[PDB]
């Protein structure tokens, strides 16, 4: 409703970078006209000439001479138009956001392709946070998010969470520190946003329920804060009826969503995208315009041509193949845990994602148990300390990945782990 | 010497992001050991399987099944090791920096592959600048740099420049506002750095001389500021004895250099690199670790395999082919200017780069002359207003690109331009 409340002075001060202003009046109008105004290098000098990329369950992708020249040249900061248009239709199909036809100033849905979803998130955090600002999130959280927020000088207020994600009652009690009208008061420092990973949180594997999302959204309206929906495992849910997203219920235009292709299409190509209210997305684009400029044109065209030949049907079929693999991996690590860790640890079944979150009984810090008996016993898992703001506190938790291990390796790994628990206890 | 003076509180507060700490003790030591600690998605799910990329004057690049899996997966934040090692040897060959074997803390040379050179520059500006800080540069300057510095709240102090770049006498007079010891004084606000494009400045085309670089470096030592050497046209110099760089004379470890492949290899692949003192490069890497994470693995491997088969010899031969093309383009636009604009405008011969900088006689603002008689006469060039901090001031300058136009198009464009000058005058 008043987006200036969520934009720093520095972010609001950004102005558009003109690599389109004079290259603008060239297509339409006088088609026979000469322009010595662009800042583009001559692509005929570039050494790569054609490309052929094979695809499993898809048509081979080919860049001919002219397409290769485009792939090797600058492109628009928000992304190439055919990828933006395909992704916009995907978001309408999956989430039907209420904001599609809003006026720009009151939150019209807008998309920005980013160089990985984390780039979008980082520039969103930078857009909003002044030192001393209060922000809300649930621990344990992705260590990369915690390391991104740390230098911004915000106070991170932990919201309680359980096996169904954020607990609305905890959020409501935290917010009772303020009155709703304090959000309009410059002195009061009400929280600027709530950040969460609603599906398959890294490291816990837990996901929010539909009922809790509705409750949380009502609190976000009442105290007027944004919801940053960081959803990189949205396409890795094992339920296969997906819970409606915050974006799908965002009648106010207060949700910024980050989607990722890193887990289903490619992490190395560095292509994700943000969806959110136009005034906030515009601030991110302007920051991109003076940093990365745009995501790799080559990699966007690879993905765009894949997605267009797949169609939404082929995309969802690919998603379902990937879910099938990870769900079988999940069953396998749960079976190994059932056999070897029962009575020595506790865990919840992951609802989505790639990780199993294991609490060891009768030990206060597993960092000693793991890092010390590592090279020794030949097994390695990740201590949970890194997923809390205070990583120095002791943690009895371990994060175990099931993305790659074979059932044999899982059995060996947990056999070894079980013996150390019984020796250290 | 004291790098903390050039690092903001927020930048200094960044800590390493652990996507290597536990994936570390896996290669060496116990080679038979199981790790459930990584955070990598399974690359067998990714849909692209092989790639074949043809190369002019080079061997065809092929990604087989295993190389493709690597290209589609996360990689180190500073770049893939074989690209970093090749680029390090290139920098030693071209610049033999004095800092190669310094201790890390006193400026050991370090490299970071970035997602385009401008990303490195942006994160360097963000690393250094507090609101109110003073910075030095020469106008006219690249509009993207000006738009990057504007929201950071620094005072930009203009240093005089002529056809040989920055004028040392102007820099010395500006610096006489302070005493050298003021650089150690928290209250005095001596300039943090000098930024310049030393070869083929955009928009002027002018380049610094060797004698002036030595003078400028001595001033940077005396008043202890950094030199940010933004050199995207280093490989597009028409002289073909290249002037020694600031990096080549950096005995103190006070130079941060940005190199670009955007003009010679590819702008769309978004691959550049920073070279500088390890403590400052480390701050940039940590920021990358929470934003883009790394440059596209796929595109790095494309470039790395090209460069390794070329060798330094094949790389320099490619550079010389590109210089040959742009120098012939330069001769062509100068010929068209000689024929049609003589007596109506003044220009200096570009020493490097892609642009001709034209001053129109007897008119105060060419923005009216160009933008209004655009669709009309069918010719387009870029008003110079965008390359000054105060873009509202009138500018009699035009930037004309010679990267692409044919000699015919240049003749037509300047014929049209000449008539408007004679009608408007």
Curated annotation (Swiss-Prot), chains A, B:
It holds the Pfam family Aminotran_1_2. Residues 1-29 form a transit peptide. The modification N6-(pyridoxal phosphate)lysine is found at residue 263. The keyword Cell membrane does not apply. Optimum temperature is 50 degrees Celsius. Pathway: Amino-acid degradation; L-lysine degradation via saccharopine pathway; glutaryl-CoA from L-lysine: step 4/6. Its cofactor is pyridoxal 5'-phosphate. CDD domains: AAT_like. Homodimer. This is Kynurenine/alpha-aminoadipate aminotransferase, mitochondrial.
